[PDB]
From a paper:
We analysed a multidomain xylanase (Xyl) from the hindgut metagenome of the snouted harvester termite Trinervitermes trinervoides that releases xylobiose and xylotriose from beech and birch xylan and wheat arabinoxylan. The four domains of Xyl include an N-terminal GH11 xylanase domain, two family 36-like carbohydrate-binding domains CBM36-1 and 2, and a C-terminal CE4 esterase domain. Instead, individual domains and domain combinations were investigated structurally and for possible interdomain interactions. Xyl exemplifies a “beads-on-a-string” protein where the individual domains are “beads” each connected by a linker (string), with each domain retaining its individual function- making the synthesis of novel super enzymes for rapid and efficient degradation of bio-waste to biofuels within reach.
Xyl bears two family 36 carbohydrate binding modules (CBM) sharing 84% sequence identity. CBM36-1 consists of 10 β-strands and a short α-helix between the first two β-strands. Eight β-strands form two 4-stranded, antiparallel β-sheets creating a jellyroll structure. Electron density for two metal ions were identified in CBM36-1 and modelled as Ca2+. Metal ion site 1 or Ca2+-1 is adjacent to the sole α-helix, while Ca2+-2 is in a depression at one end of the jellyroll. Ca2+-1 is coordinated by main chain carbonyl oxygen atoms of Gly286 and Asp376, and the side chains of Gln267, Glu269 and Asp376, whereas Ca2+-2 is coordinated by carbonyl groups of Tyr291 and Trp371, and side chains of Asp367 and Asp 372. The pocket is lined with aromatic residues including Tyr277, Tyr293 and Trp371 for substrate binding.
Residue numbers in the entry: 262 to 385
Write the structure that this text describes.
Amino acid sequence: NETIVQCESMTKGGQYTGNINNPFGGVALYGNNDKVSYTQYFASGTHDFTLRGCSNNDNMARVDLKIGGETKGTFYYGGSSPAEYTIKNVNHGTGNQTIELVVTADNGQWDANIDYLKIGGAGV
Ligand SMILES: [Ca+2]
Ligand SMILES: [Ca+2]
């Protein structure tokens, strides 16, 4: 009923997307359009999405959730300590869907560190 996809296993995109080791094994998104994405098979259309990550500092980091090219919501991190952020009851298509995690709100004040994406609901 839950599946976890490590961000470091996803396909990198953008200018500077890179791997990090601390505060967890994961990926850093440093600027706008820095992203990771992968193909998620879905047998049904409604899931909760939880991203574990954090800012690199005390400023608020944000990561956008995209599915099938549609922006479905934004994960927010109010500091540098690793935390989960859940976006509940996201509707989306079935079959193979491209899940994208992308920075769009960078302004030179923070980087987004992302550990894993957890998807909850009706068969992991
Ligand atoms: Ca940045
Ligand atoms: Ca990870």
